[PDB]
Amino acid sequence: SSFSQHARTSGRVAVEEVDEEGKFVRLRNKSNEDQSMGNWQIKRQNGDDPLLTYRFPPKFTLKAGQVVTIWAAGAGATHSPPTDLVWKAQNTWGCGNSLRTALINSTGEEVAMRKLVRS
Amino acid sequence: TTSQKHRDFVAEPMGEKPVGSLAGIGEVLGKKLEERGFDKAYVVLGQFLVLKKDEDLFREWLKDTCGANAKQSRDCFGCLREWCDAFL
Amino acid sequence: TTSQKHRDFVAEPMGEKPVGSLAGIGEVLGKKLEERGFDKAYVVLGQFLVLKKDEDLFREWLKDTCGANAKQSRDCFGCLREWCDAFL
After folding, report:
1. Is residue B61 within 8 angstroms of chain C, CB to CB?
2. Which family does it belong to (chain A)?
């Protein structure tokens, strides 16, 4: 895939999948307990480009073992909470040789990250 | 319990923060550490790791390095320990 | 280009892995390092940081501490640098 993945997770939710072409970002609750993600954020940095931030609804729950996939506006997916949220305000997550995805809780703390690097 | 500087440092990976970003490290202590050679946050983190996360040894080395007191050394050790627990 | 051990170490944060988890460190070098005191991977990470990520100093320190050769030292250094740039 020419992309090496490096992942860190400190909470119950991990950044499960990051699309190489910037179509979606998929997060999973790898715990046996549901996690509330109200006002949580996704930070995406693609090389030197300005940071892209997505904000979760003020009230939102990801149950144990479940998946929430934040889709881009250009992905053409169907918006359907709580499993599929579409970022209509952003065409795509972006592309490049340096893609960093970080999950941030409501308090501004980084709880997970997954970085993909290509040669 | 902790100052705002502590929370700011513990929140995110150190990356390239200067020594002045450490909780419990001010202008005087930062300048002294930079004079000693400890010119970046990661250097202090590595020195903390070498002493195997021991509180006493880390605080003693800090006291002999820059002349920090009980409060500043305690804040530095706490911030580094929590950062390791969060990211390392 | 890189051994599977190297990729396995780089993929995820070290946490508390044994010193034998580094790329280019086997049972023999691992045992020597553990006798020397650096009995955890993050301790070698800290010693790497203290030398300010300089390749030559770290390679020479590793060679003088355990007796590794050019290839083992190169692999360990490269793994540590990539892990620092991916997590630190």
Report:
1. no
2. Belongs to the intermediate filament family.
